[PDB]
């Protein structure tokens, strides 16, 4: 959500956002429809005043003249029903269109689709294997670490892990959550469903509605990221200045319908329907200097998890057509997957300024007693099972066993993942 | 699913069992529909036999006799068509009826509903406090360990834990997976959605269908327990005798509609729509002595976990009208909750002999090379957040802080949970 007053005063800035982000919206028709609504509310306020005027006259009206006044009263009341009616269906179409207006991207964002994305930094490299390396699925097959029968129970894009890799999945999630807690974020374990309002608040609805699974015969929806719950905890509340920045590390199960991903990562642990994710969410004051200081620590937090995980990664500056309607800036962290000879993303770091605060109604009292929309940001801390694909392949040993990074040894009790047999 | 040969060789026991378990089944009509389907099958075989000969003989039949056989074959033709439509309708009504036939309760189960459940024994004493104990919602409110705002995001029967209590939830789930993997059970991390076929296999469908949330626009349902996935894994395989008993400890988010008396003791951590559960599942050979050894193992395991968690508990033998249509036996383990002055359910141990093996089609090759339906059992290992309600009330200290049991201090990193603020 955008300030309708800057939309009215500077629609060109918003037309470049629509153009460069590829949003299918006609701003001129939005602004025309907005004028029409404001016209109908003037003429409806006028008929509402006129109606009350005639009504006031009726207590003082003698019979030959109060007969006239009810004739006038009923016609005024009838034009008021048409204006109320036409207004209600035009304001509703305006609401819908405003929910599609994108935030302008930052001035250094690459312009174009995914192909304009630009590697910013690379830390670490592909391992040099003395032996022929297996991919994560053959390493799972070989050591008995996943259960392919899950596919007949739950359908495709499903996984079930076994033995030491079942335990490593849980060890990694507790590790992420403990790392976030010693970095000052408040740990929260959360549900994975929410009402519509929370989806609207983050911007997952309307644009990404097809990516969300509804729970049938309820008004609940399964969340694709704990960002949907963490951002709605404070709707309609005015936070005190001194509470800022709010920094939440929330864990929840995540469900994605993966509509449109035809034949895309149908293979192992990369693109499943349900996974676990620890999320980093920051709500801060409305200054770019506080958004940028929070974006930088969100990124360093995820670079640090990856360095402790001993994984090779690169950061990528995300282009305007690929960051999504509400983003000011987005940087993805990608880890090297050997079996694909390429980097695959594990983390997306976004700064959304006040586009979600205006939708979800997040506000605070600033140092001068003024009330403002806060700025929000979020980044992945660690999502399983997809990092297990990069950890297996980069840490495989010649015998097909896998070593666990030094930081995860306290969490596993062992230095090597063992075949389940 | 019961054995139809035993159903009609022993109707008196299934009639007793339909009465003692409060099942709404007219056994007399089921048994009649069964005689009908079986007589239609024999008859359509006798007309198919005779139909075949009439058809073969009419090319060789002399005039007067060619006409008698044509007429008889025509008569057998119409009859066969009528026997086929009746068999198809009758068989479908009979499969829907067989799915509701209950297993006989074991002879020592109290007869009656919930009221007749008997305490077998209680281990451990109720805590003695040097102060007036707070209840677990007060301890959470005082220490800042949960987030009440989650009700606006997600609705009622939601919980969001914060700070040390969020981390204690993850620690309890990891400790129960490690305890189970140390007791010889295979660790698995599982999905929470499955196809219809898996719910019919456990018995959750048709009888408990209202207790299950469905994912709209899909053929999938959220599982109320990992038992639905773990029981459906080996459908259609014939397990080698030597793989037995299969011991699986599976972890998955569990989702429950709870559309069974909303308003039943709900506020706090006791009945929520989404929780986490580690499950003990055993598939063993079709011997009562194998079921009974597995049942005692499953119970000793949850007892040992509650001993490690330093919690007072009692065992309850469940009555025939409270155990559900598929159980042979059911023993609840209940932990003392000081603020209610009573024990509340934490673990539910079931033996279902082959009632689930026949619906899910679970078979093994017995040591004489005969293929048999196996027997299945299951018991909770640890479910959260309900165990946190008893742990906070029982382990509270004078200042409103909660200590950590000696066995969980390694999982927690500290001997006492601290306020978040
Ligand atoms: N279907 C999927 N299967 C497995 N992991 C996935 C899937 N979709 C997303 N993820 C993981 O979750 C991470 C974040 O997802 S995201 O859409 O890109 N970003 C968000 O949801 C933001 N809240 C940042 O966390 C991805 O980097 C990836 O690691
Ligand atoms: N809605 C709920 N909220 C919280 N915990 C629940 C809920 N429903 C069930 N439980 C927990 O899960 C445990 C087992 O649930 S059960 O229906 O009795 N039995 C099963 O599911 C069996 N599969 C054994 O686990 C309960 O003992 C309780 O600890």
Listed residue (B275, B234, B269, B235) closest to B251, CA to CA: B275
Whole-number Å distance, alpha carbon B301 to ligand 2 midpoint, is 16
Whole-number Å distance, alpha carbon A162 to ligand 1 midpoint, is 23
Q: Please name the residue that has the structure tokens 């194998």.
A: B290
DSSP conformation class of A328: S
Residues pairing with A255 in the sheet: A274
Contact of A239 with chain B, judged by CB distance below 8 Å, is answered with no
Nearest-angstrom CA–CA distance, B356 and A12: 66
For residue B227, which atom of ligand 2 is closest to its CA?
23
Contact of B190 with chain A, judged by CB distance below 8 Å, is answered with yes
Contact of A44 with chain B, judged by CB distance below 8 Å, is answered with no
Alpha carbon of A170: minimum distance to chain B alpha carbons (Å): 7
Residue A371: burial class (beta carbons within 10 Å; 0-12, 13-18, 19+): exposed
List, by residue range, all CATH 1.10.287.40 domains of chain A: 1-102
Nearest-angstrom CA–CA distance, B352 and B355: 6
Q: Reply yes or no on whether A386 is catalytic.
A: yes
Cβ atoms of residues B283 and B239 within 8 Å: yes
CB contact under 8 A, A189 and B166: yes
Whole-number Å distance, alpha carbon A373 to ligand 1 midpoint, is 27
| Residue A251 in contact with ligand 1 by CB distance below 6 A | no
| Known binding-site residue numbers of B for L-serine | 225-227, 279, 380
Among A166, A178, A186, whose Cβ lies nearest the Cβ of B188?
A166
List CB contacts (< 8 A) between A220 and chain B.
154-155
Instruction: Give one DSSP letter per residue of B142-163, joined into a string.
Output: HHT-B-TTHHHHH-SS---EET
Long-range contacts of A334-337 (CB under 8 A, 24+ apart): A335/A306, A335/A311, A335/A387, A335/A390, A335/A394, A336/A125, A336/A126, A336/A311, A336/A312, A336/A390, A336/A394, A337/A389, A337/A390, A337/A393
Among A170, A188, A420, whose Cβ lies nearest the Cβ of B177?
A170
Q: Reply yes or no on whether B386 is catalytic.
A: yes
Cβ atoms of residues B346 and B326 within 8 Å: no
Sheet holding A371-373, edge to edge: A238-240, A363-365, A371-373
Residue tagged active-site, from B158, B345, B365, B401: B345
Alpha carbon of B47: minimum distance to chain A alpha carbons (Å): 40
The helix or strand, by DSSP H or E, that contains position B305, with its residue range, turns out to be helix B288-308
Best of B189, B201, B418 to disrupt the A interface by mutation (most A CBs within 10 Å)?
A: B189
List, by residue range, all CATH 3.30.930.10 domains of chain B: 103-420
Q: Give the alpha-carbon dihedral of B214, B219, B224, B226, to 10 degrees.
A: -160
Residue B72: burial class (beta carbons within 10 Å; 0-12, 13-18, 19+): middle
Q: What is the chain B residue with the closest CA to A178?
A: B167
Residue tagged active-site, from A329, A334, A386, A393: A386
| Residue B204 in contact with ligand 2 by CB distance below 6 A | no
Listed residue (B175, B196, B258) closest to B224, CA to CA: B258
Residue B307: burial class (beta carbons within 10 Å; 0-12, 13-18, 19+): middle
What part of B 50-109 touches A (C-beta under 8 Å)?
none
Among B155, B193, B234, whose Cβ lies nearest the Cβ of A274?
B193
| Residue A346 in contact with ligand 1 by CB distance below 6 A | yes
Alpha carbon of B44: minimum distance to chain A alpha carbons (Å): 36
Contact of A233 with chain B, judged by CB distance below 8 Å, is answered with yes
Residues pairing with B96 in the sheet: none
Alpha carbon of B281: minimum distance to chain A alpha carbons (Å): 14
Q: Reply yes or no on whether B401 is catalytic.
A: no
SS3 B378: strand
Nearest-angstrom CA–CA distance, A194 and A200: 11
Whole-number Å distance, alpha carbon A258 to ligand 1 midpoint, is 11
Whole-number Å distance, alpha carbon B153 to ligand 1 midpoint, is 21
Which residues are CB-neighbours of A383 under 8 A, at least 6 positions away?
A254, A275, A276, A277, A278, A346
Number of CB atoms found within 10 A of residue A44's CB: 18
Which tokens belong to B270? 């006791």
Query: How are the residues of chain B apportioned to helix, strand and coil, as percentages rounded to the nearest 5?
Result: 45, 20, 35
Residue B195 has, within 13 A of its CA and on its CB side, a CA count of: 15
For residue B333, which atom of ligand 2 is closest to its CA?
27
| Known binding-site residue numbers of B for ATP | 256-258, 272, 345-348
Residue tagged active-site, from B271, B293, B314, B365: B271
Nearest-angstrom CA–CA distance, B134 and A167: 35
Nearest-angstrom CA–CA distance, B69 and B59: 10
SS3 B134: coil
Matching CATH number, B103-420, of 3.30.930.10, 3.30.160.100, 3.30.365.10, 3.40.50.1820: 3.30.930.10
Which tokens belong to A132? 């022929």
Nearest-angstrom CA–CA distance, B103 and B23: 11
Produce one character per residue of A383-403: b if its CB has 16 or more CB atoms within 10 Å, e if not. Answer: bbbbbbbbbbbbbbeeeebbb
Nearest-angstrom CA–CA distance, B228 and B333: 21
Among A150, A174, A215, whose Cβ lies nearest the Cβ of B215?
A215
End-to-end distance of chain A based on CA atoms, in angstroms? 54
How big is the CA angle at B408 (ends B406 and B411), to the nearest 5 degrees?
A: 135
Nearest-angstrom CA–CA distance, B264 and B268: 12
Which residues are CB-neighbours of A74 under 8 A, at least 6 positions away?
none
CATH node for B1-102? 1.10.287.40
Best of B145, B154, B197 to disrupt the A interface by mutation (most A CBs within 10 Å)?
A: B154
- Nearest 5°: phi and psi at A416? -140, 145
List CB contacts (< 8 A) between A174 and chain B.
170-171, 174
SS3 B109: coil
CB contact under 8 A, A155 and B188: no
How far, in Å, are A84, B316, B319, B320 from residue B119 at the CA level? 67, 4, 11, 15
Whole-number Å distance, alpha carbon A55 to ligand 1 midpoint, is 61
Q: What is the chain B residue with the closest CA to A167?
A: B187
Q: Reply yes or no on whether B271 is catalytic.
A: yes
- Tell me the pairing of strands B186-189 and B246-255: parallel
List CB contacts (< 8 A) between A154 and chain B.
191, 193-195, 198, 220, 229
Experimental method, per PDB record: X-ray
List CB contacts (< 8 A) between B181 and chain A.
167
Nearest-angstrom CA–CA distance, A273 and A255: 5
Alpha carbon of A302: minimum distance to chain B alpha carbons (Å): 20
Which residues are CB-neighbours of A47 under 8 A, at least 6 positions away?
A76, A79, A80, A83
């Amino acid at each position: 959500m955008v300030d309708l007053k800057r939309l009215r005063q500077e629609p060109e800035v918003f037309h470049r956002a629509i153009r460069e982000k590829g949003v299918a919206l006609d701003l001129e028709a939005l602004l025309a429809l907005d004028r029409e609504v404001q016209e109908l509310k003037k003429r409806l306020q006028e008929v509402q005043t006129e109606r009350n005027q005639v009504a006031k006259r009726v207590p003082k009206a003698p019979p030959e003249e109060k007969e006239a006044l009810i004739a006038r009263g009923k016609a005024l009341g009838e034009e008021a029903k048409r204006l109320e009616e036409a207004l209600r269906e035009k304001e509703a179409r305006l609401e819908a269109l405003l929910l599609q207006v994108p935030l302008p991207p930052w001035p250094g964002a690459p312009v174009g689709g995914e192909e304009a994305n630009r590697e910013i930094k690379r830390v670490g490299g592909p391992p040099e294997f003395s032996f022929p390396p297996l991919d994560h699925v053959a390493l799972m097959e070989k050591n008995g670490w996943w259960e392919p029968r899950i596919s007949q129970v739950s359908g495709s894009r499903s996984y079930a892990l076994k033995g030491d890799l079942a335990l490593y999945e849980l060890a990694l999630l507790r590790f992420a959550m403990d790392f976030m807690a010693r970095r000052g974020f408040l740990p929260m374990t959360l549900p994975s469903y929410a009402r519509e309002k929370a989806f609207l608040g983050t911007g997952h609805f309307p644009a990404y509605r097809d990516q969300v699974w509804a729970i049938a015969e309820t008004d609940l929806y399964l969340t694709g990221t704990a960002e949907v719950v963490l951002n709605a905890l404070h709707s309609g509340e005015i936070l005190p200045y001194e509470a800022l920045p709010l920094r939440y590390a929330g864990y929840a199960p995540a469900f994605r319908s993966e509509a449109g991903s035809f034949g895309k990562d149908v293979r192992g642990l990369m693109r499943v329907h349900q996974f676990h994710k620890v999320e980093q969410y920051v709500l801060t004051e409305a200054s770019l200097e506080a958004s940028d200081r929070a974006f930088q620590e969100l990124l360093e937090n995820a670079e640090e998890i990856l360095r402790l995980l001993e994984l090779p990664y690169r950061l990528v500056e995300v282009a305007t057509g690929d960051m999504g309607p509400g983003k000011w800036r987005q940087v993805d962290i990608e880890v090297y997957l050997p079996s694909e000879g390429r980097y695959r993303e594990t983390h997306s770091c976004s700064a959304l300024l006040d586009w979600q605060a205006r939708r979800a109604n997040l506000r605070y009292r600033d140092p001068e007693g003024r009330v403002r929309y806060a700025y929000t940001l979020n980044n992945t801390a660690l999502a399983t099972p997809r990092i297990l694909a990069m950890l297996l392949e980069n840490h495989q040993l010649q015998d097909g066993r896998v070593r666990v990074p030094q930081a995860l040894i306290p969490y596993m009790g062992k230095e090597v993942l063992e075949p389940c047999g």
